[PDB]
């Protein structure tokens, strides 16, 4: 793998920018923290810029194609991604071939504009078994990782609660509190720009 991490200084505005987006986009969930745990804030341990030429070229190339298919606009968004496969993703890239076939929006790659949403998917679907060490979805000890990714949404189909994008579309926007999820069915419509290492913070 030709993938490379840049540790960002916490005084670095680029860090603070992602730091802020992460903290500010937290919300009260339907769950009551059953999936991602109980917290109002994160402990932000490490933000690393992911650098990989093969993956950057794969993305921009697709981004161009999509623009041409969508009135010369990529419809590019910074979105959080949670999943068990973050360590794989930063090396091999996002890969649709590992999508969960029984998602509410079919076999795609789910993003969110709310850190606290993506957080839910970190230890699997609906938080899964929780952390590997304590089997606790609300673990304040075990360090978690999210991705803050450049995502090419293109022309996004609006759905509510499938295998590819609907015809003439590049992404799906859902809203099942209604919060926004986003789905792609092609790994190269997303680049994982920042690797965020963090804990959820116990409130009091
Ligand atoms: C309420 C149900 O809601 C959701 C929300 C999000 C997702 C989701 N979104 N993305 C994923 C992951 C599959 C995709 N995986 C990769 O890009 C990838 C890339 C390289 C890999 N290499 C080795 C092994 C696995 C690898 N996986 C990201 N997943 C995902 C897929 C399978 C299991 C868990 C997941 F979160 N699925 C369902
Ligand atoms: Zn734990």
From Swiss-Prot:
<comment type="similarity">
    <text>Belongs to the ARTD/PARP family.</text>
</comment>
<protein>
    <recommendedName>
        <fullName>Poly [ADP-ribose] polymerase tankyrase-2</fullName>
    </recommendedName>
</protein>
<feature type="binding site">
    <location>
        <position position="142"/>
    </location>
    <ligand>
        <name>Zn(2+)</name>
    </ligand>
</feature>
<feature type="domain" description="PARP catalytic">
    <location>
        <begin position="9"/>
        <end position="204"/>
    </location>
</feature>
<feature type="binding site">
    <location>
        <position position="139"/>
    </location>
    <ligand>
        <name>Zn(2+)</name>
    </ligand>
</feature>
<feature type="binding site">
    <location>
        <position position="131"/>
    </location>
    <ligand>
        <name>Zn(2+)</name>
    </ligand>
</feature>
<comment type="function">
    <text>Poly-ADP-ribosyltransferase involved in various processes such as Wnt signaling pathway, telomere length and vesicle trafficking. Acts as an activator of the Wnt signaling pathway by mediating poly-ADP-ribosylation of AXIN1 and AXIN2, 2 key components of the beta-catenin destruction complex: poly-ADP-ribosylated target proteins are recognized by RNF146, which mediates their ubiquitination and subsequent degradation. Also mediates poly-ADP-ribosylation of BLZF1 and CASC3, followed by recruitment of RNF146 and subsequent ubiquitination.</text>
</comment>
<feature type="binding site">
    <location>
        <position position="134"/>
    </location>
    <ligand>
        <name>Zn(2+)</name>
    </ligand>
</feature>
<comment type="subunit">
    <text>Oligomerizes and associates with TNKS. Interacts with the cytoplasmic domain of LNPEP/Otase in SLC2A4/GLUT4-vesicles. Binds to the N-terminus of Grb14 and TRF1 with its ankyrin repeat region. Interacts with HIF1AN. Interacts with RNF146; this interaction leads to ubiquitination and proteasomal degradation. Interacts with NUMA1.</text>
</comment>
